[PDB]
Assembly symmetry: C2
């Protein structure tokens, strides 16, 4: 899907008004994710909703991810209630901009 | 309140990122609002509809990456001629975020 991948890349460059770093880990990862999503779509297999997101966030933003978990550690120690993993995902996403 | 708890969460954030949060800024306010909601869901022991919640979060907080992901998803659907699920837009947004920055 050479022309398809090129077109997807162009939409991203136009939209974000940047040129991709084709050297970078983030880019290499994106193209691999797109190639794999193509296959899942062809096969009509479901997306993994949950624990997949966690690994992704850990790899893309280790510092925000681990920061989320230190927050959650303090919350558990204080409030004593269990913490559903989905909470580390939301916090990681709220921390990235800071 | 959870005032001291909040204060302690913010120090930890400041120290992790090697920064000072301007406590008279919109991003100090945004941050603590999201954090109080986390506390409330933990204390009250409430689960979230995770695909549903992420889509809402991303739309509000990463609107450029989210909207661009939806455009890509529609291209894939039209080219491959297959259904695409909502979860794709989410996982694709998360790969774009580090790209836009």
């Amino acid at each position: 899907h050479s022309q398809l991948m090129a077109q997807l890349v162009e939409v991203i460059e136009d939209s974000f008004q940047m040129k991709v770093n084709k050297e970078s880990v983030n880019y290499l990862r994106l193209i691999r994710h797109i190639r794999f999503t193509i296959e899942r779509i062809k096969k009509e297999e479901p997306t993994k909703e949950p624990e997949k997101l966690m690994l992704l966030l850990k790899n893309e933003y280790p510092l925000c991810y681990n920061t989320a978990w230190k927050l959650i550690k303090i919350l558990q120690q204080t409030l004593k209630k269990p913490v559903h993993e989905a909470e580390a995902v939301y916090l990681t996403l709220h921390l990235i901009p800071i």
